[PDB]
Symmetry: C7
Subunit: 248 residues, 7 copies
C-alpha cells in the first residue's frame, strides 16, 4: 500500500533463506543428524520469473571499471587541401569472437552378402567371390555458436579548408560493476531445486515474492512496491577513448 | 451489428471449451465410464487462421519487464579539440546466437569382385588376389538455423568545441509481458486435434469464431466485432539505457 | 475495345473450367464411364506467363491481419545531459531463419592388389602379404538455402537538452490477406497438365487469355482490358509498433 | 554514313539466317538429300561480342509485369508523443536464396604390409599378425554459389508531434518484359556452332555485323548505325508498394 | 627530355618484338633451321613492374558497351498521404556469385595388432581374436574463393504531400571497352619467358622500358615521358537505368 | 584519505614482490637450500579483478608508433561535370583475418554378425556369408574463431561544379605504445599461482590492493586513491593517412 | 641533441651491415677460410620493434602507380521526371578474394573383439562370428583465412528536375610505390638471426638503434631524432575514376 522495498534482491535472498529454513525443517522425520547444518546446501535457482510492473530503471553513479586488455589503437591523419570545408572519415575496425559447440550422432545399419566360390580346376584354389553391400547412416547434428563483435566506428570530422585533424581511437575491453536504481511493482515466483547433500534428499522448492514480505505490504494486485537500486556487477564491456585534434 | 467483444481469447477459449464439451459428449456411445472427466484432456491447437479485418492495434500500458541478465556496458569518452563543433561516434556491439539443427541420411550400395588365385609353385601358397570395388552414396541433408542479433548502436554526439561527452550504453536481456489494445473484425476457424487420452480416442476438431458467439452478434460478412485489449506475455526482449553526459 | 474485366482470376478460373470441360469431353472415345465426373480432377497449373501491359497496381483497404506470434519487445531509455539537443539511437535486432536442403551423390571405383606369400620355413605359417589400393571418388553436391530476416531498426530520437525519451518497439509475425486494385492489359497463355485420375489419362492442356473471353472484348493487340481488384491472401509479414515518448 | 537500323536483333537474326543458308548450301557435296531442310537445325550462339560505341540507352514504355507470387507485407505503426517532430523508422526485411553446386574428386593410393605368424605351440593356432597401412588422398573441389537478395528497406517517416503514421510495404516477385530504346554504333562478330543434325555435320560458323548489312551502310570505322528499341523480355524482378499514411 | 610517347603499349610491344628478335638471333649456334620462323613463338609476360611516376589518368570517350544479359528490373510505387513531404525508399537487390577452389591432401599412417587364438576345445574351432588399431591422418587444405556482388541500391525519393512516385531500376551485365588517357613517367622492366617451341629451347627474357626507346628520350631519372591514351578492353561491368517519375 | 598513488602497477608489482617474499619465506621448513633464490620464480597472474571506482581515464601524449607493414594505398579521381556542386565518394576496402581453432572427439561403437555357411555340394567350397553391421558415432566439436577487420572507409567529397578532387588513403598496420592518465579508487584482489620450481612446490597466492599499501592510505570503503598515468604498450593498431586535394 | 637523421632505413641497414661485419669477424677462431666472404650471407630480420615517439608522418609526392588489371566499369543513367530536384543513386559493386589455409590432425585408437565359432553339425562349416568394435578419433584443426574486399560505392547525385546524369565508375587494381616523410624519435632493437652458410654457423644477432649511431647523436632518453622521408614501395592498391556528367 504505502510501504516499499529497496531491492528485488533483499526479497529473493530472503525467500531463499526461507526455503533453506523450511527444507532443513523438513529433515526432522528421518535424518535430523544434520539439522543445524545450515551451510554448504547450495540452494540454486532454476526458474526466476518475477515481473517489474511499470518499471522506471535509470542508472546512477559512474560504472566501476575493471580493465582487462587493450584491443586497438588507431590513428588517422585527415588532410584537406580543397579550398572548402570537407568532412573526412577515419578508419573502422571490428573484432569478432565466435565459439561454436556441436554434437552429432550417427546410426549406421549395414548389410553385406558374399558369394565366394572356388573352382580349383585351372590351378590351385583360384576362387572368385562377389560381395554386395548396403548401408544406411542417419545423423542428427545440432550446433550452437555465440558471436560477439566490438566495432570501433569511423568518425567523420569537419576538417577546415587547408588543415588536418588527427583522430585517435583507443578501444579497451573491460567488465564493469556499477549501480542502477529502479522503481516498480514486483510479483512472481521462483522455482528452483535444493541439491541433495550427500546425506540429504533433493527437493524442488518454489516460493513467490508475496509470501516473502509482510502481508499488507503488497498492493491490491499482489505486487509489492520496490524503490531502491540494483547492482549489475561483472558485465563484459568496452571503453572507447576518441581524441580528435586539429593540428596546423 | 452493435455488440462487440473484448478479446479474441474470450472467443478462442470459449470455442475450445465448446469443443471439449462436444467431444466428451461424443463418448456416450461406447466409453461413458470417463464422462464427467472434464480435465487432463489437453485440447491443443494446430491451425489457427482468424483474420482481424481493419485492425487498429496500439499498445497501452508500460511493458512489465522480467530481467534475465546483463549483456554489455560500454563507456566512451569523446574529446573534441578542433575549435569547431564536431560530431563524434561511440563504439558499437553486436551479440549473435545461432542454433543449427541438421538431419542427413546416406544410402550406400557397394559391390566388390575378388579374383584370388594361389600358385603354390614358387614356394608355399604365394597367391595373388585382385579385387575391384564400386559404391554409390546418396545423402540428403536439410538443416535449419535460427540466428538472433542484439545490436547496440553507435551514438553520434554533438560534442562542442573544446570539451568531452561521456556515453554509457547498458544493454540487458529481458522478456516482457505487457498489454495491447486492438479493434477490428475477427473471422475464421481453428482446426486442431483432441489427443487420445489413454482410454479415449483422437479426434480432429475444427470450430469457427462465428458459432462460438451469439448469432446476430456478427456483422453481415460473418465477422464479429472486437474492441478490447490482448496480452502478449513472455516475449523475448532487450532494454538499452543510454546516458550521454557532457563533462568539463 | 471498350469492355473490361474485374480480375485476372475471373479469366484464369474460367479458362481452367473450360479446360476441365474439354478434357472431360475428350473421354467420349473409350472411357465415358466417368463422364459427368466433373470433380476431383485437380487441374493444376504449371506455366503461367500472363503479362499485364501498362499496369497501375495500388493497394486499397487495410490489410487483414492474422497474428502468429510475438518476436521481440525492446525498450530503450535515452537520457541527454549535454546542454544541447542531441539525437540518440535505440538498439537494433535481427532474426534470421535459414533452411538448407542438400543432395550429394558419390561414385567410388576402388582397386586392390594383394600379394600374400607364406614361408612356413622359420616357424608355422609366417606369411607376409603386401597389398596396394587405389580408389576414385567423384561427388556432386548441389544445396539450396533460403534465408529470411526480420530486422527491427534503431530509431534516432531528437531528445531535448536535459530529458529522456522512451522508445518501445514491438515486432510481431503475421500473415496478411488484403486486397489490391490494378488496371492494365493482360495477355498470354497458361500451360499446365491434367493429372491422370486413377481411371483417366494425363494430358498437358494449354489455354490463353484470349480464347477465354468474348472476341472483340480484346484490344487490337490481343490484350484484354482489366480494371478491378486482386486478392493477395496468406502472405507472410510483420507488424512493428513503435511508441517514442518523452518522459520528464 | 546516313542510313541506320532499328535493332541489333534485326542484324543478329539476319546474320544467323545467312549462316543457316550458307551451311545448308555447303551440303551440296555429299549429303544433298536433306537440302531444302531449312528447319530443326538450331543454330545456337556461343561467342557474341558486338560493341555499341557511344551508346545512349534509355527505357521507354512502362514495363509489362508478370506477377509470380507475394513475398512480404509489413505494416508498421509509428507513434510520436514527444512534443516535437521526430523521424521514426519501420522494420526491414531481406529474403536470400542461395544455390550452390559442387564437384570434388578424390584420388587415394593406399599401401599395407601384414606380417602374420602362427605359433601353434601354446595352444591351437594362436597367431599374432601386425599390419601397417599408409594412404594418400588428394581431393580437388570447386564449388559455385549464386545468392540473390530482395531487401525491403526501412522507411524513415517524419511523424508530427503527437500523431502516428502507418506504413505498408508490399513486396512481390515478378518478371518483366518491357522495351528499351538505344542508339549507337554496333560492330563485331559472333562465333557459334551449327550442331550436327543426325544426318549432318557440326560446323563452327562466325559472322560479323558488317557483312550482314549493305556495304556503305557502315561508317568509316566499320560500325553500322543503330537507332531503334530493343526488348528485354523475361527479366526477374520485384515490385514494392509503399503507402505511408497519417492516421489521427 | 622533351620527347614523349603515346602509350605504354607502344613500348611494351616494341620491347617484346625486340626480345623475339634477340631470341631468334640466339639460334644461329646449333638450330638455325627455324631462323626466319618469326611466328607461333608466343612470348608471354610474367613479371610486369613498370611504374608511372606522377600519373594523371582520366577517362575520355564514352565506354563502348557489350550487353551480356539482364539481371533485374524492379518497380516501386511510393505513395504519400501524410500532409507533408516525406522521403520514401524503394527496394534493394544484390546478386552474389562465388567460385571456390579447394585442394587438400591427407597422409594416413595406420597400425594394427591382431592376437587371434583358437581353442577348438568346446566345439569346432571357436577362436577369439582381439585386434587394436591406431592411425594418424594429417590433412592440409588451402581453398580460394572469389565473390562478386552487383548491388542495386534503394533510392530515397522526395515524394510530395499527397502523390506517388514510380521508380524503375533496370540493372544489366555488360563488359566495356573504352579508352583512357594518361600522362606520366614510366620506368621499369618486364621479366617473362620464351616458351620452348617443339624444336626450340626455353629462355627467360627480361627487358626494361629504357632500352626499348631512343636514348636521350628519357629524363635524368631513367623515366620516359608518356602522354597519350591507353585502352581497357573487355572489363566486366554493369549498367543501371533509374527512372523516377511522379504520377498523379 | 588524502594520499594517492600514481599507478595501479606500482601496487600490483609491489604486491607480487610481497608474494614472492612470503612464498620464499615459507621455505624455511623443509627446503631452505634455495632460500635467497629470489629469481626465476615466475609469479604469474591468474585472477585480476581490481575495480577503479569513479574512473576518469583520458589519454595524454601522442602514441608512439611501431610500423609493421603497409596494407593498402587507394587513389580516387572524382570528376564533376554537372553544373552543380555534387558530393562524390571514393572506394572502400576491408581486410579480414580469421583464425579458427577446432577440437572434436568421436566415439564409435560398432557391432557385426556374420553367418557364413559353405555348401561344398555344387562344386568346391562355394559358401555364402551374410553379415549385418551396426555402429554409433557420437562426436563433440567446439571451435573458436577470432576475426579482425581493418576497414578503410569511403570519403564523400564536396567536389565543386566543374572540377576534380583526388583522394589518397594509405592504411598501415602498426602497434602502439603510448601513455594514459587516470584517476579513481582501486580496490580488489589478485589470485594467481606460484609455479613449482624444479625443487619447490606450487602455491596459489592471493593478495589484495589494501594490504599492499600503507593503512590509512585507503578511503573509508577500502579503496585507495590513484592519480597518475598507466602505460598501454604493444597494442595492435592502424594508421590512415587521407589527403583529399582539388586539382584543376 | 641537435643532429637528426633522414630515415629509419639508413639506421637499420647500417646496423645490419655492422652485424654482418661482427659476425664475419667472429669467424677468426676456427673457420677463417671464408673471411672476406662479405656476401650471400642473407642477414634476415625477425624481431623489429623500433618505436617512433611523437611521430608526424604525412605523405608527399603523388604515388607512383603500377597498373595490374581492370576490375569493373559501371555506367548508370539516372533520370528525374518528378518536377523536383531528387538525389538518385548508382549501383554498387564489391569484389572479395578469400584464401583459406587449414591443417588438421586426427589420432584414432580402435579396438575389436571377434568371437567366431564354427558348428560344422548342420552342414559343412556353417560358423557364426560376432565382432564388436570401439574407436576414438581426436582431431585438432586450426584454419586461417584472409579476405580482401574492393568495394566501389554507390554515388548519390543531385539530378535536377527534368534531366539525367551519367555516372561512370572505373575501378582498377594497382600497387603503388610513393614516398612518405616523417619526423620523430626512434628507439629500440632488432633481433634476427644470421642463417648458417653451408660452411658457417647460425647466430642470433640483436642490435639497437642507439649503438648504430654516433653517441651524443641521441637525446637524453636514448632516442635519436629522425627528420626525412621513408619509402613504401610495392603496396597493393586501387584506383577509382568517377565521372558524373549531366546530359540533356
Amino acid at each position: 500500500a504505502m510501504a516499499s522495498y529497496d531491492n528485488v534482491d533483499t526479497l529473493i535472498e530472503k525467500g531463499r533463506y526461507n526455503t533453506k529454513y523450511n527444507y532443513l525443517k523438513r529433515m526432522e522425520k528421518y535424518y535430523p543428524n544434520a539439522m543445524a547444518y545450515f551451510d554448504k546446501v547450495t540452494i540454486n535457482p532454476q526458474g526466476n520469473d518475477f515481473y517489474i510492473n511499470n518499471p522506471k530503471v535509470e542508472l546512477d553513479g559512474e560504472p566501476s571499471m575493471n580493465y582487462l586488455e587493450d584491443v586497438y589503437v588507431g590513428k588517422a591523419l585527415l588532410t584537406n587541401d580543397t579550398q572548402q570545408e570537407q568532412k573526412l572519415k577515419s578508419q573502422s575496425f571490428t573484432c569478432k569472437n565466435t565459439d561454436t559447440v556441436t554434437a552429432t550422432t550417427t546410426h549406421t545399419v549395414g548389410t553385406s552378402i558374399q558369394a565366394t566360390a572356388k573352382f580349383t580346376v585351372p590351378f590351385n584354389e583360384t576362387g572368385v567371390s562377389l560381395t554386395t553391400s548396403y548401408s544406411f547412416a542417419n545423423t542428427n547434428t545440432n550446433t550452437n555458436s555465440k558471436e560477439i563483435t566490438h566495432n570501433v566506428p569511423s568518425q567523420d570530422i569537419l576538417v577546415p579548408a587547408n588543415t588536418t585533424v588527427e583522430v585517435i581511437a583507443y578501444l579497451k575491453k573491460v567488465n564493469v560493476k556499477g549501480n542502477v536504481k529502479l522503481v516498480g511493482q514486483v510479483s512472481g515466483s521462483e522455482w528452483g531445486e535444493i541439491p541433495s547433500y550427500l546425506a540429504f534428499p533433493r527437493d524442488g522448492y518454489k516460493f513467490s515474492l508475496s509470501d516473502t514480505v509482510n502481508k499488507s505490504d503488497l498492493n491490491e494486485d499482489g505486487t509489492i512496491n520496490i524503490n531502491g537500486k540494483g547492482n549489475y556487477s561483472a558485465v563484459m564491456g568496452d571503453e572507447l577513448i576518441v581524441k580528435v585534434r586539429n593540428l596546423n
